[PDB]
From Swiss-Prot:
EC number of the protein: 3.2.1.17
More info: Lysozyme C is capable of both hydrolysis and transglycosylation; it also shows a slight esterase activity. It acts rapidly on both peptide-substituted and unsubstituted peptidoglycan, and slowly on chitin oligosaccharides.
Entry superkingdom: Eukaryota
Catalytic residues of the enzyme: 35, 52
Every C-type lysozyme domain range: 1-129
Gene Ontology CC entries for this record: cytoplasm; endoplasmic reticulum; extracellular space
Protein name from the UniProt record: Lysozyme C
Annotated organism of origin: Gallus gallus (Chicken)
GO biological process, one term: killing of cells of another organism
Coiled coil: none
Alphabetical UniProt keywords: Allergen, Antimicrobial, Bacteriolytic enzyme, Disulfide bond, Glycosidase, Hydrolase, Secreted, Signal
Gene Ontology molecular functions: beta-N-acetylglucosaminidase activity; identical protein binding; lysozyme activity
């Protein structure tokens, strides 16, 4: 599923991401835009052989099991394919674990390089929330 901007903002708000660990809703929408272009089916292969999955591009090296990343962890206790569903619950629940691990949203390279230090509130402007 390819979300609209305000549609995704409302879905993330309902799932408790607004101000989660101090990150306002616009940060999460901005991260999803640049990680996946709002597409739940996005996948991308990394150089080390791991793969990033879903709207927030969660990495199989640490967070999910895809059966093809030897020596990796599965810290969210899910198959990586669950991160590609049109229902974002699994992605959001795993993202809450990632952002709590000490490095905040810096775990998302596109957030650090394209959202951090910008007017992220623009990403929710005009939305009924
Ligand atoms: Cl915001
Ligand atoms: Cl933080």
């Amino acid at each position: 599923k390819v979300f609209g901007r305000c549609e995704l903002a409302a879905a993330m708000k309902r799932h408790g991401l607004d101000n989660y660990r101090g990150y306002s809703l616009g940060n999460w929408v901005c991260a999803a835009k640049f990680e996946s272009n709002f597409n739940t089916q996005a996948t991308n292969r990394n150089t080390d052989g791991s793969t990033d999955y879903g709207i927030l591009q969660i990495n199989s090296r640490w967070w999910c099991n895809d059966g093809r990343t030897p020596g990796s962890r599965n810290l969210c206790n899910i198959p990586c394919s669950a991160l590609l569903s049109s229902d974002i619950t699994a992605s959001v629940n795993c993202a809450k674990k990632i952002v709590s691990d000490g490095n905040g949203m810096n775990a998302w390279v596109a957030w650090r390089n394209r959202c951090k230090g910008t007017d992220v509130q623009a990403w929710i402007r005009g939305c009924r929330l």
